[PDB]
Every structure is written in C-alpha cells, then in structure tokens.
Design a protein around this ligand. Structure first.
Ligand SMILES: *[C@@H]1O[C@H](CO)[C@@H](O[C@@H]2O[C@H](CO)[C@@H](O)[C@H](O)[C@H]2NC(C)=O)[C@H](O)[C@H]1NC(C)=O
Ligand SMILES: *[C@@H]1O[C@H](CO)[C@@H](O[C@@H]2O[C@H](CO)[C@@H](O)[C@H](O)[C@H]2NC(C)=O)[C@H](O)[C@H]1NC(C)=O
Ligand SMILES: *[C@@H]1O[C@H](CO)[C@@H](O[C@@H]2O[C@H](CO)[C@@H](O)[C@H](O)[C@H]2NC(C)=O)[C@H](O)[C@H]1NC(C)=O
Lengths: 49, 33
C-alpha cells in the first residue's frame, strides 16, 4: 500500500511562531507543449491513389 | 483544539468514524448515489 508522504506533526500552540532565518534560491523546470507537427492528408490520394 | 475560538469540528476528520472522514465529507459521500 502506498505511503502518501512522510509524517510531519506541526507543533502548533497558541503563542509560538516559527520564523525563517535563511533562504534558498530554487530554480525549477516546467515543460509545456505548444504546437504539434502540421500534417495534411490528400483524401482522394489516400483512399484511392 | 485551541484555535482562539475557531471551531473546525465539521471539517476535521472524525475519530469516531471508521473512514476517518469529516462530518461534511461523510454527508457528501452519503449524498452521492
Ligand atoms: C519548536 O518547538 C517544538 C516543541 O518544542 C518542536 O517540536 C518538536 O520537534 C521534535 C523534533 O522533531 C519532535 O521530536 C517533537 O515531537 C516535536 N514536538 C511537538 C509537540 O510536535 C519544534 O521542532 C521546534 N522548532 C524548531 C525549528 O526547532
Ligand atoms: C544561509 O545558508 C547558506 C547556504 O546557501 C549559508 O552559506 C554557507 O555558509 C557556510 C558557512 O560559512 C559555507 O561553508 C558555505 O559554503 C555557504 N554556502 C554557500 C552556498 O555560500 C549561510 O551561511 C547561511 N546563513 C545563516 C545565517 O545561517
Ligand atoms: C465545536 O463544534 C462542535 C460541533 O458543532 C461542538 O460539539 C457539540 O457539543 C455540544 C455540547 O456538548 C453537543 O451537545 C453537540 O452534540 C456537539 N456536536 C457534535 C456534532 O458532536 C463543540 O462543543 C464545539 N466546541 C469545541 C471547543 O470543540
């Protein structure tokens, strides 16, 4: 059976906050298709030659 | 569940239910046939 994610319990309390002290500059890739191959079919030639 | 007066019982999972669903989620699953 698959595991959805690693378990993480956030330590919530009514008077505690977590503040970041550092940062990471992260570059991520996103690949998106834009166009396809432009295909034309001669219907008469394809069916009958 | 001390959230400064905010109540989330209707949306948090119900421990009593075997499916571990919220009351709203349980209602949604019941209303779909
Ligand atoms: C802020 O404090 C809380 C509580 O003192 C820390 O939460 C604990 O983290 C340890 C390490 O993973 C766990 O073993 C404990 O079970 C956590 N406690 C609770 C109540 O969840 C928390 O890690 C602290 N934050 C930082 C950045 O150190
Ligand atoms: C914030 O994180 C960066 C990591 O990018 C820390 O930079 C590193 O600092 C150590 C200690 O001087 C060096 O050995 C590493 O080579 C540094 N890494 C890079 C990429 O420069 C930075 O020191 C951290 N700052 C704080 C305040 O924690
Ligand atoms: C949050 O809301 C829940 C549900 O709206 C409250 O639970 C109700 O409590 C009363 C008083 O004991 C019962 O008569 C109801 O039957 C309970 N409803 C359900 C659905 O169990 C709850 O008291 C509210 N407050 C907190 C702090 O959880």
């Amino acid at each position: 059976t698959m595991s959805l994610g690693a378990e993480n319990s956030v330590a919530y309390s009514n008077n505690s906050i977590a503040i970041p002290t550092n940062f990471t500059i992260s570059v991520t890739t996103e690949i998106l298709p834009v166009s396809m191959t432009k295909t034309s079919v001669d219907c008469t030639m394809y069916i009958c030659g | 569940k001390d959230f400064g007066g905010f109540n989330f019982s209707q949306i948090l999972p119900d421990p009593s239910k075997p499916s571990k669903r919220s009351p709203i989620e349980d209602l949604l699953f019941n209303k779909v046939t």
